[PDB]
């Protein structure tokens, strides 16, 4: 029932903000239980960003996670993400969009 908002980065050439946008998230592991093939948060999370930046391509992208050491680590699967959030201790959850 939790919610977590998820702020995304869009990087240009430069590396620069083009636009910030932000979604509610369910704390809960997947939206479906059924149609769910495998995916569920990365697949979920991919989908707003495509259609809150409608910049670039659609599923031509690849966000990419801080680590650790801060290091850029572009993520695309569900156990990317429950790794992801063990890192930020509050509920928002920060990533870097960049279109292919």
């Given at each position: 029932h939790m919610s977590l908002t998820v702020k995304a980065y869009l990087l240009g050439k430069e590396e620069a903000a083009r636009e910030i946008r932000r979604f509610s998230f369910c704390?809960?592991?997947?939206?479906?239980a059924e149609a769910a093939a495998g995916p569920g948060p990365c697949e979920r999370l991919l989908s707003r960003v495509a259609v809150l930046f409608p910049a670039l391509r659609p599923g031509g992208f690849q966000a990419h996670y801080r680590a650790e050491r801060g290091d850029l680590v572009a993520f695309s699967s569900d156990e990317e993400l429950t790794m992801a959030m063990?890192?930020?201790?509050?509920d928002i959850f920060r990533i870097y969009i960049k279109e292919k």
């Open positions: 704390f809960s592991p997947e939206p479906e063990s890192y930020v201790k509050d």
